[PDB]
Design a protein around this nucleic acid. Sequence first.
RNA 1: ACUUAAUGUCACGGUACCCAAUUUUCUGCCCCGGA
RNA 2: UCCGGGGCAGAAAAUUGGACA
Length: 1256
Amino acid sequence: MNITVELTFFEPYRLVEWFDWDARKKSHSAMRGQAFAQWTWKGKGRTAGKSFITGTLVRSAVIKAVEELLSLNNGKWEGVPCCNGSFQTDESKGKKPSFLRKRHTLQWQANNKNICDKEEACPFCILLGRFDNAGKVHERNKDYDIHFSNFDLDHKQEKNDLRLVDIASGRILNRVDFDTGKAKDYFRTWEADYETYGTYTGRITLRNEHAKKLLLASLGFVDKLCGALCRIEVIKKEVLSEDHNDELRKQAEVIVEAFKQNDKLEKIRILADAIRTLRLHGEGVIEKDELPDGKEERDKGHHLWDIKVQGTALRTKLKELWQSNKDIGWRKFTEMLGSNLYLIYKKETGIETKEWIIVGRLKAATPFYFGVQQPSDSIPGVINEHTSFNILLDKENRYRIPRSALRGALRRDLRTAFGSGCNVSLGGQILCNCKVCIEMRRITLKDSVSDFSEPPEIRYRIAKNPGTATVEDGSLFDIEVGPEGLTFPFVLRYRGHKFPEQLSSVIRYWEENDGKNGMAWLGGLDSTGKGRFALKDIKIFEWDLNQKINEYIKERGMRGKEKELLEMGESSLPDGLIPYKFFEERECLFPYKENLKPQWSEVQYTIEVGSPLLTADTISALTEPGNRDAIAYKKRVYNDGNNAIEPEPRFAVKSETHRGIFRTAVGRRTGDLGKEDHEDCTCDMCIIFGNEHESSKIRFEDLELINGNEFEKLEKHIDHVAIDRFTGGALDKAKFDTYPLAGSPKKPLKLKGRFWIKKGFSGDHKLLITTALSDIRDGLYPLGSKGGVGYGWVAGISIDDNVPDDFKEMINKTEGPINNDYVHPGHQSPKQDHKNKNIYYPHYFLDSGSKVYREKDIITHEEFTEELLSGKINCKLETLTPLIIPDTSDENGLKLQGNKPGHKNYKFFNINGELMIPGSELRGMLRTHFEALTKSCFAIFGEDSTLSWRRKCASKTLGGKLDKALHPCTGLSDGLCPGCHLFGTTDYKGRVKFGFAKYENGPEWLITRGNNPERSLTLGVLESPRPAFSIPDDESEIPGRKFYLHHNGWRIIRQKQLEIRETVQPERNVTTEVMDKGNVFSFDVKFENLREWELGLLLQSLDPGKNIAHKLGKGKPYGFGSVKIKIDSLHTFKINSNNDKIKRVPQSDIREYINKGYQKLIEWSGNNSIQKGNVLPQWHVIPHIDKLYKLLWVPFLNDSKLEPDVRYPVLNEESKGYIEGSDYTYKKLGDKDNLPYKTRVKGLTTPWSPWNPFQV
RNA sequence: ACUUAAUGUCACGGUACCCAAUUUUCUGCCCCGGA
RNA sequence: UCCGGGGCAGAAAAUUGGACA
Ligand SMILES: [Zn+2]
Ligand SMILES: [Zn+2]
Ligand SMILES: [Zn+2]
Ligand SMILES: [Zn+2]
């Protein structure tokens, strides 16, 4: 009469600490522990315990089982009506039974008059224990009628004691409102394992065989026990790893202090994130050394992977360490190294019923994420690792979907389906029987684990202070995300009288068909489009409970093989299971057509990009063979076809950027983004996008790229470099590069994207969104980074038709002048040349006073202030002399290295074979001119450089001789110089944004006969500038800015090709294509939020007037690169809540702008003695502008036959190209005698000074 | 035993959720001396 | 006293703050 009962699980269950009820009544946090298994300590300490299950719980479950089984057959066994029950009374005759218990107990109506009485006891009460020697709370004997010994754990390696951290893990659970999204509270819980500790053993004894068939059959029926499924079955009869966690600590220290020796402490954090990101690639990168080896020799290497530690290269120490500890595995290796480095850096800084089954597959049509607390939550009682959040993970690194979240989301959607929502109550004494609760307590779910087991992906998110459009400090964090395209199994049970049509509603709503994308919104962070799911291969089954109960038991409820059902053939089904017809499909279901479907409405559209596009992701760049600095973002996706990551990634733009763009747009428009009372900001932005109080009402997604294959080379190298405003050469450590996507004005990129709206918007709210969309289509907000220099502009929008008609209407309804200035610089009358001979100097210097005007106040970017203007300008760029702009991406474009090794060749800057000028160069040119005009601060100047006259060393560096007032404008408090104020600086984004230049009208290539490519040139020799000759000795000072001259001295080289190629070594010449005269490029600037006279001065600077021109391009001092700019069209629009739209401006208004700007500079001069009156402006009254214009003055434009001779001096008189008898060389010009130093300085600071006879 | 009480366990009664543009600044440029 | 040669190849700041009594 002994029955050994074995228990089994199929899903991770829960555990809680043990207590006596005498003590348990106190610790309220143990109260929930009345249904979970028990875990007891042992050995007067921690970590050594035992696990069991209280027999009482098994008893209660068997009771509920017998109750249901009897309710089904209308209350009889084999036709024997039995007793209606006895419980719910137990009053005042003894102790109220421990575990006072309440729920809708049920009693069928019966006929018999015996209650399983003493002499004749129907099996039910014998099973209860009513007629025995039982005793309420006394257990003196093992004298019971039917006994339940408690169930304890089964373990094969029990020779050692179970450790708590081995079979337990902490987790947090919470609860959210029906509306407002937010959470209200949270409790803690312990989850077990179900793979290795899932068997539980017990023991049961009986006394009277008479009641067996009831119990032995009612056993298999029960399903839940301790919070999961089960199958009760009657049974017939490596410590170094830990040391590793410490030992690697040691090694970490060595790496740190060495970096401290070279004054490189901040790069530690970069190294940490990079070595973490190394997690995806695999071991190969170390064992074959695919690390981004440095540039060409440089006698150095990568600025990171080649630092020296203890006299060794880092990229070798890494291989050594991996060889040391290779038992752990690549994954934990990298993770531990990252954590250790993070911590060290942080320390250093400081009426019948039936059962319906649903099987099927879940798919995730977007990147998903479920969040958990943090690492370092050991099970018993500011260590924040370098991952501010984490995805959940299983034991073997697999993605899980815990039944908690599935249950919750199912409830929320069902609650919408009905229409009435009971906000859940805690610990009540009655049951809120609104229908939603009635359904919600009849369903059962199951967890889910995928097959993919690779590490996740990382993303970053920053904030942006709308004050100055800058990275808002103290806000930079990163989240983890799972791959898109994974698939889980999904199981949903139901038991009752009639399949509620609203359950069918929600299932259909989660379904996906040919033209219907599902919208199941599992998981958190559903605000920015993470978590959307869909269903596939739904196959609903149903039982017949009323007359096939033995067929249900014999298959143990078909629990534990829920995978077989999805794929088996209809014929091999187990007897008693039948496919479900009458599945109403999306048509008759009234709630779905009525309450669900209009929940979310989608908008879908494609942006069209017409320029290079770049979303900087600097971290990935450090682990790629490109040796670059910035790369386009990359997403990776699963593919259900091949069960592996797709071999080729996909470029995109992250959703959060989408969201930020719309947010800033609407905010800046309504003028609500600047107020600080935003926790309760009652303006419309807080209603739409949602502050912390309520949820949000817009959901974005990722911008994907589809027009990708048509391009043959997606990513095009580009280089950029600063220039010392004092010597027109490259500053030190200031030559970098980017590698963005290719985007042309003719073959534009194509990006597709979507975003959802929750039903309930009220009229004008739609108007705001539509306005912002039209505003993007106008082209004010650039996608990506580096806006001001052209990257990432937009050029149109094509709203797809399958949208709300309201949007189509609201969006579609909303969509010869400027001659030259004629300044007549008056610097004329033959330049005193007399046509005979005057060898001038290639470049000259310019002095610009000392005082600088500054403004403490700053104009913000909060909103389009009404008193200021904003618009765009179009322009055409016309060339005057052969031009050159090399393309540094290629080094053998002209195939010339096949004969003369080491000889560089280039070809003109081009994109998909469409000539084009990079804009940043135009930005630099305009900026130099504007600064020099307005007497700004030196933007980019190398202070740390010492010279030695010839040994006279420099007592102080260059920055010492230069006045302090002219040093770079550094801090926001001190104020900003007018130059830096307009174009911006490190902490204030500029307000003027240029753009690339397009190509136009004809004759193009200066054709030469002798040269092999017939259109290329071989430039002369070029050497570095020498600030020494400009500063003769110690007492000298920085003269000023540098400028190059205009002359037709290039054609000389156009006839010495054959000779130049002879004498000069091919290691120092460069050959490239050239563009001739007579070409015009398209060009345009866009400005927003300017003051009044600033725009006037900018316009004056774009075109100084007739007879004047800028300089640009490689090879300035020889004469290549004279350029003249005109204006064609101006647009200004004072955008605001008013209906004022884009309007033109006629001529004679720009006159007012320029005139007012002129007076502002008049005032800044402070010497009011200058003429004051009303007349067409005359620029050549203020001293320094006079010189500035005297410098850049095309002589040969007006008088077509007045050209001077400009050239550098030969070296030493018997130098190579020494003009005989000229006496135009050093050692007769640089000697202190025959030329006092002050006279040299004076000759360098008076433009257009005769130099061969050396007058003035 | 450590480890339960017996004519009365809705904890499958509770989603770790809300909110936050990887961005701001920078012309692919160029002459006189070294032991 | 004799006779010629390339350099720069990334620099600075931000690495988490609030919430749910
Ligand atoms: Zn009875
Ligand atoms: Zn309710
Ligand atoms: Zn608000
Ligand atoms: Zn400044």
